[PDB]
Design a protein around this ligand. Structure first.
Ligand code: CLA
Ligand code: CLA
Ligand code: CLA
Ligand code: CLA
Ligand code: CLA
Ligand code: CLA
Ligand code: CLA
Ligand SMILES: CCCCCCCCCCCCCCCCCC(=O)OC[C@H](CO[C@@H]1O[C@H](CO)[C@H](O)[C@H](O)[C@H]1O)OC(=O)CCCCCCCCCCCCCCCCC
Ligand SMILES: CC1=C(/C=C/C(C)=C\C=C\C(C)=C/C=C/C=C(C)\C=C\C=C(C)\C=C\C2=C(C)C[C@@H](O)CC2(C)C)C(C)(C)CCC1
Ligand SMILES: CC1=C(/C=C/C(C)=C\C=C\C(C)=C\C=C\C=C(C)\C=C\C=C(C)/C=C/C2=C(C)CCCC2(C)C)C(C)(C)CCC1
Ligand SMILES: CC1=C(C/C=C(\C)CCC[C@H](C)CCC[C@H](C)CCCC(C)C)C(=O)c2ccccc2C1=O
Ligand code: SF4
Ligand SMILES: [Ca+2]
Lengths: 41, 732, 123, 142, 74, 40, 165, 74
């Protein structure tokens, strides 16, 4: 939302995306799948 | 009780062991086996799956453009492509220490970054991109395309938009549309980019979306094309004094046939690349108008195949009864596709090192090396899949009564001939190719280099002289100007092809010596052996004296028991499993020959390769040991530099490679009994007995461990080499 | 399976029965705050003395108990998903039941983070 | 012959115990009970690990695997030439007479046994997999 | 056993074997076992790769038999 | 001796003999005609 | 000539390779007394080297800038330019002995086939009859062709067991 | 015994044990001499002491020395 391209990520984007993708996001995926994999039929 | 994870496989769903989780991920994209699978539903599912893969490819490409634009040095590299190093992305590692943060700041940045070896920069420059906006716009565009394909996967799976099996089996039309539209109209369309954007940009003139409808690609315009005087578009070519991206030395031609490479870029000329796509586009469109559709004029494929039976009856019923075989078998088609794609994947690597198709591509040695090795390895895996799916076709979808006397059924008739003859060639190549390496090594060790046998590759040198190589002094065809071919091309690409082929600072037809003779025959041994393994498995896929009912046992089965001595690795899955190792060995030798031939070319010490390669000891000490000196010193007790990641990966590759051995050397049994003891301990342990496993812990399956060990083995061979190939080429 | 002097000594078969897990009778939440604090207070230790900022001044104990709190929370999620993937049919000891585990997990999360705070207030 | 009924009060052989016997499966899933009749008190080898003194007359031993019970069965039928019989005690108490389930040990032909899983064609007269493709049926079974 | 023989080969060359010179002794590898053996790379750069020079360059000398056997062994 | 000669005929013994003669022949050939790189 | 391969006789590097290689042995001869077996030996190695590094050139062995003799495989090139002694002529020599060994082997195999227990004449080889068939392979090419032109070298396709297709 | 006896014999005729005895430090043990053929004579390196053979690593010379053996007749 500045200069020319209005979608240039902020300098803090890496300090958020990298932590979320690799620690938080994976935990949700592993836990959600774990429940489905063990889900009874 | 029964689980839901393996929805497709109720057997796995009811499996009380943990194997259900492992197999559920494997037997996942084998719909042909899924519970309740119809041929039409299978095709519809595959068709949608294709859209999904197309969404990933475009999303993957958009990400590269985005990171190159947001975290890159494109404009800076474009200004000085022979000094600036293309930046792929930034390293936000919350674990990096301060020396790591300092050492990885390179290529002109304010933080730790990763230089790119994909060569996207050189390519995007040559095609017209000059700023970061061009990258952002492209990324958004490709991202939108990815979204469209994703909706299409949904649309084509929702009743009323799900194609019938008949549409999936409409070959004549599909081929016509793909050849004319997908291949032809996408080549003429590309000429339209080149002629309108790439060529003008290379001559310094922004022709973007803002002024393309008002900028004449050629000064005369479409007049010459309409008047038939097409030549006007091949006059005033860019002079040698031309500078890419500058009007300096810029000409006015749009389509020409100069040949060779631009002097500064050292890469094929754009105009010659424009006329290429125009010429091929015309052929593709005309070729598209061949098979029959819904109008009348046309060729029915079935008729062509059935009308081709040798009158001497040497090929039996010839190709009669083969159209249904290919049209009703999705493994036969996939095998042909993988074989075709695999082979062409190799042409891209063999034709992109010799003829750099992108500006300043040759300058970037690390890119060149990492691009050859990438395609050559990907090609090898694709080829293994070709034969693999071919064996599946023999068992899952081959009707021995319909194919009776056809060229496909008269192959198993001489299956032993094909297999045995592939054995003799492999042994001959093996016994001799190695014997003349040990013989030379012995002479090197006994200080008798003159006594070492060095056969000259005269046959290849003549093919080089035929193309115009003069060093050899054979005066053949193009080498002899007074010839017919030489005189005919003298007014076209010939003047350039020679200048370029007779320059030893590039890779067009590099001088070959007796060292290349031995390695080339070694490559042949790998090609023949790997082939023999896959061919033997394919022919014996549903038949064999040891296991005459292999088809009844399917494709992937561990063994038929210890009966008849040993049936270990008797499934046609195990011809693939074993062929993979030989494929890696073969590609290993080819990507090691490229790297050394070229590292010696780039360092200026061509005599190094022309002599050390003759004996194997030279390949280890002069190549692997000498080049590994820097990579291994990425991090030492005194400090660390930017090559630390490659040193860490190099060791990491060895670890994954060694781990793969356990799953291959050790077998299911010692582990199973060991797991039994572990189960007992946990049930008896107090405070831990409270927590328990929902799935019974079992050892990896016999076939499962084969693939798990092979994945570890392959991953290693790739990471260990990728580290070397990049950290040794970059270190210098 | 083979009654050994070790796995039978009435002293050790009694020590085990006073630990807040074999003490069936205490409400599963109160059998979770007990276990939670016990496993939570000692957690900060390894991070305070051997962690990344172990040799920085003052911020070596805040960083240990912050990291511990992190793991405590991670341990909680694993406890929760375990009950969801073990009590699909909500299988005596109410701890070994669907609701029993959901109250044990909560007692642990509120007892362990209380223990991690006790260890910082003990530095 | 009448399917023998289990007497769960049968003297069990003399054995100190082993870390190699029954686990949770015995109760949560199922277990098996082999029984025999000795002529003298003799030491035999347990199919689980170790040695045990069989008692004179009725004996009863419990396992968590049919192969384990049958193993001891063959051991007694050969080393002691006994005629052991084993059942399958389900968690509800449902005892099912597993062996010989006829009176005549499988090997010996006896009228009154129906033919199950018996294809009446040469193994090389089975169809092609393509004929059973998308049918979810094996070539051998079809 | 391989690690044991490597441990003896490196420790000794680094901390025992050497020439006693005036005021000090020159170890075959200059006493680099301590700081170079705590990592797996040091066992590859300062041991395997560094000490492998003699065998890979034994060709042409009385030791050329070991260079040949070294590869033959691989 | 009929049975000793039978033993001296077994595969392992015959192969040991044949090879020794062939090896010695090549060794002796190079001993008198050394460095045979080409047939001249 | 041929592929830029200069004759070793005109190859300077080949000459240097001689000079430097005999110097490396005339420096190992000095650290030994004139009569010691060590020295008699190093003087033989110097003579043998000086003979080989000349027998090769006299054979017209073209060598590259490396100074190491190279071989020509093409029959036309090898014959037309007198380089037949390398690879070409040697090729037939091996083929003759190779076929000789193979032909003698099949002669023995097909004699023991039929004879009583053919399997016990493969382990305990009949050295007498094996020694009566070795020379029979001298004219193997003549006999092999006579068998092709009589249909006896190969077996009928309806008498060879084949794996189920 | 045959192996042991062969070692003494090879260390009796084809060896530099007596030469090593006079100067054990600067002379390398050697007790294997290769025939002069196929240029394999390169293996006969200058172990010192008027002898060109193969440096042995079996510790037999030092064993014989501590046994008193001072000649190749013993
Ligand atoms: C398959 C393509 C692809 C790949 C392999 C990556 C890979 C990476 N991205 Mg990225 N990204 C992509 C597409 C991709 N991106 C697209 C299309 C966008 C536009 C929405 C972004 C926007 C983006 C931002 C803003 C950031 C990254 C960052 C990162 C790095 C941190 C790891 C991570 O996953 O963080 C998470 C990144 C995301 C969740 C965004 C990607 C989501 C796309 C749509 C999925 C593909 C990492 C190497 C971080 C970085 O630069 O570290 C230095 C960061 O700040 N990406
Ligand atoms: C003009 C009409 C037309 C066109 C353009 C297409 C186009 C396409 N069809 Mg299709 N089809 C058509 C008519 C058409 N079809 C008709 C009438 C039918 C009814 C019978 C079908 C039935 C059909 C089926 C059943 C399927 C397709 C599929 C596909 C896609 C193939 C996947 C791919 O990526 O190929 C792309 C290939 C190229 C663009 C050219 C190939 C050039 C080679 C591979 C490499 C060239 C690289 C170059 C030299 C350098 C590149 C450098 C740099 C750019 C990297 C493709 C986009 C498949 C699909 O859905 O996939 C999603 C598939 O399943 N079609
Ligand atoms: C467009 C290319 C293509 C397509 C559509 C398929 C499709 C298929 N392959 Mg296949 N394959 C290919 C290329 C391809 N393959 C290549 C290039 C190779 C050589 C490496 C192989 C080697 C191969 C083997 C050996 C086997 C298959 C099998 C299968 C079938 C089920 C396996 C599966 O897909 O689930 C998923 C497969 C995986 C998740 C792979 C597991 C481990 C990988 C390496 C990890 C990748 C994770 C990302 C399936 C219909 C199996 C089969 O025939 O069924 C009986 C099987 O045995 N393929
Ligand atoms: C360095 C390891 C190595 C080596 C050297 C080989 C070598 C070979 N493999 Mg192989 N392979 C390997 C690893 C290796 N493989 C691994 C890890 C796998 C995965 C399990 C495979 C899987 C595999 C398969 C599936 C196949 C092969 C095949 C072959 C042969 C191909 C034909 C040939 O070239 O004949 C050339 C012959 C030689 C190079 C031998 C040299 C001559 C000998 C050494 C001299 C004679 C003995 C000498 C006088 C003294 C030694 C004996 C003495 C002590 C008594 C070849 C000999 C193919 C095959 O079997 O051929 C039909 C084939 O089917 N390989
Ligand atoms: C094993 C495969 C093989 C291969 C790859 C070659 C390759 C070659 N051969 Mg050849 N040759 C072979 C087998 C092979 N040969 C065999 C088995 C024989 C015995 C019958 C010969 C006998 C032979 C002769 C007599 C000659 C060649 C010649 C040549 C070279 C050019 C001739 C040509 O155009 O095609 C290949 C030709 C043939 C296979 C036989 C036909 C003879 C040719 C056509 C006469 C050409 C004469 C002329 C001088 C060649 C011009 C080459 C050019 C550089 C000026 C060429 C590099 C020529 C040469 O360079 O020698 C001076 C030539 O004179 N060959
Ligand atoms: C009479 C002995 C004999 C004969 C005539 C042949 C002939 C043949 N073999 Mg064969 N082979 C033999 C023994 C023999 N073999 C033995 C003992 C073995 C076990 C090591 C093999 C293993 C073998 C393999 C793996 C292969 C062949 C192959 C072949 C064919 C390729 C031609 C070739 O280059 O030879 C090749 C020969 C070898 C690779 C090794 C054998 C070489 C020995 C030293 C020769 C036998 C001498 C024999 C002991 C003499 C007996 C004399 C008697 C008085 C006792 C060919 C027709 C190839 C094939 O099938 O082609 C389709 C192939 O793949 N052979
Ligand atoms: C490639 C061709 C070739 C040929 C034809 C020979 C031939 C010979 N070598 Mg040699 N060698 C070669 C290559 C070759 N070598 C290479 C490449 C190397 C480097 C690894 C060597 C290293 C070597 C050594 C170190 C020695 C030989 C020796 C010998 C001779 C006797 C072999 C022996 O001691 O067996 C052993 C015989 C017995 C143990 C008696 C058998 C009694 C039974 C087994 C009980 C013999 C004439 C020996 C020698 O020179 O003799 C003085 C010896 O010392 N060679
Ligand atoms: C080497 C010569 C060994 C002795 C020999 O060949 O004949 C040895 C002859 C014949 O050697 C064997 O003798 C055995 C019966 O005593 C065998 O059964 C055969 O008769 C015969 O082959 O017997 C001896 O004289 C014993 C010699 C022991 C030395
Ligand atoms: C001139 C020559 C060469 C030229 C080669 C060229 C251009 C073509 C070669 C074709 C070749 C080499 C072979 C084709 C063989 C095809 C067949 C059908 C022959 C099979 C031979 C068989 C079956 C005989 C087997 C034998 C029998 C029966 C008994 C004994 O003889 C033993 C044995 C096993 C040999 C080059 C490579 C340049 C190099 C220089 C020598
Ligand atoms: C982005 C990007 C990319 C991709 C691409 C793709 C894959 C696709 C695209 C595509 C496109 C983007 C295309 C374009 C288009 C446009 C157009 C096409 C227009 C035109 C106009 C006009 C005006 C014309 C008209 C006409 C025609 C059409 C026909 C004839 C007639 C006429 C001429 C009239 C890449 C990766 C390389 C990199 C960089 C980025
Ligand atoms: C080690 C070994 C085992 C035992 C290996 C086991 C039990 C694997 C244990 C893996 C645990 C679960 C951790 C694995 C970590 C993975 C990286 C996690 C993700 C793996 C996939 C989900 C991608 C076998 O069962 C076996 C069977 C047949 C031949 C060889 C072998 C064999 O070598
Ligand atoms: S060892 Fe394993 S693979 Fe081999 S026959 Fe036995 S079970 Fe099958
Ligand atoms: Ca632009």
């Amino acid at each position: 939302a500045a200069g020319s391209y209005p979608f240039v990520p902020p300098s803090w984007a890496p300090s958020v995306f990298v932590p979320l993708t690799g620690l938080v996001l994976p935990a949700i995926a592993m836990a959600t799948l774990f429940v489905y994999i063990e889900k009874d039929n | 009780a029964t689980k839901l994870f393996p929805k497709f496989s109720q057997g796995l769903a009811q499996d009380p062991t943990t194997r259900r989780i492992w197999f559920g991920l494997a037997v996942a994209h084998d719909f042909e086996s899924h519970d309740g699978m119809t041929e039409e539903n299978l095709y519809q599912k595959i068709f949608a799956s294709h859209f999904g893969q197309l969404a990933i490819i475009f999303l993957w490409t958009s990400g590269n453009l985005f990171h190159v634009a947001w975290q890159g040095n494109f404009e800076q590299w474009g200004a000085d492509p022979i000094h600036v190093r293309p930046i792929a992305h930034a390293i936000w590692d919350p674990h990096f220490g301060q020396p790591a943060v300092e050492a990885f700041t390179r290529g002109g940045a304010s933080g730790p970054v990763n230089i790119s070896t994909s060569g996207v920069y050189q390519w995007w420059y040559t095609i017209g991109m000059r700023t970061n906006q061009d990258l952002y716009v492209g990324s958004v565009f490709l991202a939108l395309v990815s979204a469209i394909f994703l909706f299409a996967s949904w649309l084509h799976l929702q009743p009323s938009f799900t194609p019938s099996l008949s549409w999936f089996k409409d070959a004549e039309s599909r081929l016509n549309h793909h050849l004319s539209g997908l291949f032809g109209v996408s080549s003429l369309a590309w000429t339209g980019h080149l002629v309108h954007v790439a060529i003008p940009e290379s001559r310094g003139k922004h022709v973007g979306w803002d002024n393309f409808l008002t900028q004449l690609p050629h000064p005369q315009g479409l007049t010459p094309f309409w008047t038939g005087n097409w030549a006007a578009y091949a006059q005033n070519p860019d002079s040698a004094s031309h500078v890419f991206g500058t009007s300096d030395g810029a000409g006015e031609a749009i389509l020409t046939f100069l040949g060779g490479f631009h002097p500064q870029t050292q890469s094929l000329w754009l105009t010659d690349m424009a006329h290429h796509h125009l010429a091929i586009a015309v052929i593709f469109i005309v070729a598209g108008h061949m098979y029959r559709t819904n109008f009348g004029i046309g060729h029915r494929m079935s008729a062509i195949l059935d009308a081709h039976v040798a009158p001497s009856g040497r090929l039996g019923a010839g190709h009669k009864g083969l159209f249904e075989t290919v049209n009703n078998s999705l493994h036969f088609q996939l095998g042909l596709a993988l074989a075709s794609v695999g082979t062409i994947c190799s042409l891209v690597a063999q034709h992109m090192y010799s003829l750099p198709p992108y500006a300043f591509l040759a300058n970037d040695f690390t890119t060149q090396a990492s691009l050859y090795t990438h395609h050559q390895y990907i090609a090898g895996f694709i080829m293994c899949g070709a034969f693999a799916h071919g064996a599946i076709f023999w068992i899952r979808d081959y009707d021995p009564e319909q194919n009776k006397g056809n060229v496909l059924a008269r192959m198993l008739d001489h299956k032993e001939a094909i297999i045995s003859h592939l054995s003799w060639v492999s042994l001959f190549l093996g016994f001799h190719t190695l014997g003349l390496y040990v013989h030379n090594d012995v002479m090197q060790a006994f200080g008798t280099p003159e006594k070492q046998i060095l056969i000259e590759p005269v046959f290849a040198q003549w093919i080089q002289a035929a193309h115009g190589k003069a060093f050899y002094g054979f005066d053949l065809l193009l080498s002899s100007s007074s010839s017919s071919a030489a005189s005919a091309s003298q007014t076209l690409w010939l003047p350039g092809w020679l200048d370029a082929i007779n320059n030893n600072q590039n890779s067009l037809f590099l001088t070959i010596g007796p060292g290349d003779f031995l390695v080339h025959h070694a490559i042949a041994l790998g090609l023949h052996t790997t082939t023999l393994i896959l061919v033997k498995g394919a022919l014996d896929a549903r038949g064999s004296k040891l296991m005459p009912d292999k088809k009844d046992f399917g494709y992937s089965f561990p063994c038929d028991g210890p009966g008849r001595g040993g049936t270990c690795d008797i499934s046609a899955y195990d011809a693939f499993y074993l062929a993979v190792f030989w494929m890696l060995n073969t590609i290993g030798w080819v990507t090691f020959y490229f790297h050394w031939k070229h590292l010696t070319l780039w360092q200026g010490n061509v005599s190094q390769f022309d002599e050390s390669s003759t004996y194997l000891m030279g390949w280890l000490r002069d190549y692997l040991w000498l080049n590994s000196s820097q990579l291994i010193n990425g991090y030492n007790p005194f400090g660390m530099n930017s090559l630390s990641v490659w040193a860490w990966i190099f060791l990491f590759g060895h670890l994954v490679y060694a781990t793969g051995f356990m799953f291959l050397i050790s077998w299911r049994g010692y582990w199973q009994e060991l797991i039994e003891t572990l189960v007992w301990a946990h049930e008896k342990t107090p405070l831990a007995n409270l927590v328990y496993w929902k799935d019974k812990p079992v050892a990896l399956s016999i076939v499962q461990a084969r693939l798990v060990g092979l994945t570890h083995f392959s991953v290693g061979y790739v990471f260990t080499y990728a580290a070397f190939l990049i950290a040794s080429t970059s270190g210098k | 399976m083979l009654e050994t002097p070790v796995t039978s000594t009435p002293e050790v078969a009694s020590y085990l029965s006073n630990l807040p897990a074999y003490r069936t009778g205490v409400a599963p939440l109160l059998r979770g705050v007990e276990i939670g604090r016990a496993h939570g207070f000692f957690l900060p230790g390894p991070f305070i003395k051997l962690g990344p900022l172990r040799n920085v001044e003052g911020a070596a104990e805040i960083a240990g108990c912050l990291s511990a709190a992190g793991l405590v929370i991670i341990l909680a999620a694993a406890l929760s998903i375990y009950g969801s993937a073990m009590f699909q049919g909500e299988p005596r000891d109410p701890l070994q039941s669907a609701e029993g585990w959901n109250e044990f997990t909560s007692g642990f999360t509120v007892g362990a983070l209380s223990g991690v705070a006790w260890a910082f207030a003990c530095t | 012959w009448t399917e023998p009924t289990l007497n769960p009060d049968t003297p069990s052989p003399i054995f100190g115990g082993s870390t190699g016997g029954l686990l949770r499966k015995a109760q949560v899933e199922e277990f098996y009970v082999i029984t025999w009749e000795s002529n003298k008190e003799q030491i035999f080898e347990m199919p689980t690990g170790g040695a045990a003194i069989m008692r004179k007359g009725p004996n009863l031993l419990k396992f968590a695997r049919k192969e384990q019970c049958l193993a001891l069965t063959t051991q007694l039928r050969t080393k002691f030439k006994f005629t052991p019989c084993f059942y399958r005690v389900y968690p509800s108490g449902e005892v099912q007479y597993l062996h010989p389930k006829d009176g005549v040990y499988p090997e010996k032909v006896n009228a009154g046994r129906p033919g199950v899983n018996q294809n009446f064609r040469r193994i090389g007269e089975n169809v092609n997999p393509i004929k059973v493709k998308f049918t979810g049926n094996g070539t051998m079974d079809i | 056993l391989s690690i044991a023989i490597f441990h003896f080969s490196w420790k000794m060359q680094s901390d025992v074997w050497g020439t006693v010179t005036a005021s000090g002794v020159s170890h075959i590898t200059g006493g680099n076992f301590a700081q170079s053996a705590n990592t797996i790379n040091g066992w590859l750069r300062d041991f395997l790769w560094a000490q492998s020079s003699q065998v890979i360059q034994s060709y042409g000398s009385a030791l050329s038999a070991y260079g040949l056997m070294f590869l033959g062994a691989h | 001796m009929k049975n000793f000669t039978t033993y001296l005929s077994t595969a392992p013994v015959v192969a040991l003999a044949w090879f020794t003669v062939t090896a010695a022949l090549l060794i002796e050939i190079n001993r008198f005609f050394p460095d045979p790189l080409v047939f001249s | 000539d041929i592929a830029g391969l200069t004759p070793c006789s005109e190859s300077a590097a080949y000459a240097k390779r001689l000079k430097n290689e005999v110097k490396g042995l005339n420096k190992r001869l000095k650290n030994y007394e004139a009569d010691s077996a060590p020295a008699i030996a190093l003087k033989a190695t110097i003579e043998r080297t000086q003979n080989r590094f000349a027998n090769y050139a006299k054979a017209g062995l073209l060598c590259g800038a490396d100074g190491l003799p190279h071989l020509i495989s093409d029959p036309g090139l090898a014959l037309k330019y007198g380089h037949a002694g390398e690879v070409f002529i040697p090729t037939f020599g091996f083929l003759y002995v190779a076929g000789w060994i193979g032909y003698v082997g099949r002669l023995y195999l097909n004699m023991v086939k039929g004879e009583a227990k053919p399997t016990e004449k493969e382990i305990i080889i009949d050295v007498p009859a094996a020694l009566r068939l070795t020379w029979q392979g001298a004219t193997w090419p003549v006999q092999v062709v006579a068998e092709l032109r009589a249909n006896t070298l190969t077996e009928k396709a309806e008498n060879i067991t084949i794996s189920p297709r | 015994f045959i192996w042991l006896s062969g070692m003494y014999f090879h260390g009796a005729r084809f060896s530099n044990y007596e030469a090593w005895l006079s100067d054990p430090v600067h002379i390398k043990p050697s007790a294997q001499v290769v025939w002069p053929v196929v240029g394999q004579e390169i293996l006969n390196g200058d172990v010192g002491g008027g002898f060109q053979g193969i440096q042995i690593t079996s510790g037999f010379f030092q064993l014989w020395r501590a046994s008193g053996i001072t000649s190749e007749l013993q």
